[PDB]
Amino acid sequence: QFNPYGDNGGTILGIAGEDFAVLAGDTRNITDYSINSRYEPKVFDCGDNIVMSANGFAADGDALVKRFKNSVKWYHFDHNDKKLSINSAARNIQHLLYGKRFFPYYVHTIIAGLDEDGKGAVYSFDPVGSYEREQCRAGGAAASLIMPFLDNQVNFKNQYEPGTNGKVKKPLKYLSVEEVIKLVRDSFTSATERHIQVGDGLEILIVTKDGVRKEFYELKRD
């Protein structure tokens, strides 16, 4: 018997700003308990201020990135160098997924960038299609250690003005990129201990409207 699906593990984290978006994920690649590669990105820039990761099972992840970077060339070609929006990209991916659902894909996709209001964008996707815009969503292996922490510290969840005993919500957080950079790394340094498919290298792609910033940061190899 043949079963075509594996796993390559890893985790990603898309945190939508109000003037940026940040897509970060670990560069470790594993197949069970053997470490396949330390450092080999799962996080890609796809040109014209949209970034792309398809994390889960690497063999699919490759193919789905390569068809997206084809659908950029073909837009420039047939629409006369029109810029391709985050919003239009989101849908276009879902066809890519759906077309082979009868044979399933097994990757979670988070794309990010800036759209035409100049707000942060994150769309996250389920494997068999569908997408939803959210301000923050984690994905991949270690996601569920990451997400309730992220929902606490960004969106200020279950937090309340002191001395009224929960009758006024604590006032919402105005994002800026520097608080956000510190935050990514603190959250990851924890996941890496407690979850064994994360670690090694961390690659933070930042999108701003001025260009795409690549800031690499090491983690422990524990």
Partner: protein, 212 residues
């Protein structure tokens, strides 16, 4: 996951929850199940998220193109019996669906048709579909008036989604309401389920199961 919609004399109150899961933990808590087919057609995502969302968006392709050829937008019967065949072919090929197409036209009045993975196309006046559809059915049918105000009809909307949130594992998060008139839907806010809870317990005295 629970969806419902009801006829009354003012139109169709369509109400949904905003929580869905995967596994056993809550995958999204902002996951809006109101899928705009058209400015005059709402479709309600239960069953497989992928299948529902994609196909209802493509339904809106065939609603927009029908309207170009015949110069008059689609009847609710006619839109539903587009969807039914589509589904039906992917029968014995494996699909998942569980939508209501809710529409108000001037040739058919309010109409709701329920479409299912099996390929039933059923008419009716109250349709509650989903994992928690038993908890919805109840609060909805016990305070059912065809002679109903639009203010009470929202407030009824809310309390059938909060029954559904309270007992279903997989329902809750937030509540969206849309009132479909003839002139199409108008959006009545996003109201957190968490935040909603304590105001209804305060008013009605209900929820005497949960400690003060």
């Amino acid at each position: 996951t629970t969806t419902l919609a009801f006829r009354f004399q003012g139109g169709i109150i369509v109400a949904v929850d905003s929580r869905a899961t995967a596994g056993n933990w809550v995958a999204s808590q902002t996951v809006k199940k109101v899928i705009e087919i058209n400015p005059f057609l709402l479709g309600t995502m239960a069953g497989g998220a992928a299948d529902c969302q994609f196909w209802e968006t493509w339904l809106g392709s065939q609603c927009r193109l029908h309207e170009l050829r015949e110069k008059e937008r689609i009847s609710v019967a006619a839109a539903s019996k587009i969807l039914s065949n589509l589904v039906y072919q992917y029968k014995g090929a494996g699909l998942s669906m569980g939508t209501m197409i809710c529409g108000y036209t001037r040739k058919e009045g309010p109409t709701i048709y329920y479409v299912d993975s099996d390929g039933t196309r059923l008419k009716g006046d109250i349709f509650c579909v989903g994992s928690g559809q038993t908890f919805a059915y109840g609060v909805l049918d016990s305070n059912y008036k065809w002679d109903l105000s639009v203010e009470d009809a929202l407030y009824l909307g809310k309390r059938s989604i909060l029954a559904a949130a309270h007992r279903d594992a997989y329902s809750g998060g937030s509540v969206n309401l849309y009132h479909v008139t003839e002139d199409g839907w108008i959006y009545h806010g996003n109201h957190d389920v968490g935040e909603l809870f304590w105001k209804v317990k305060e008013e009605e005295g209900s929820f005497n199961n949960v400690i003060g």
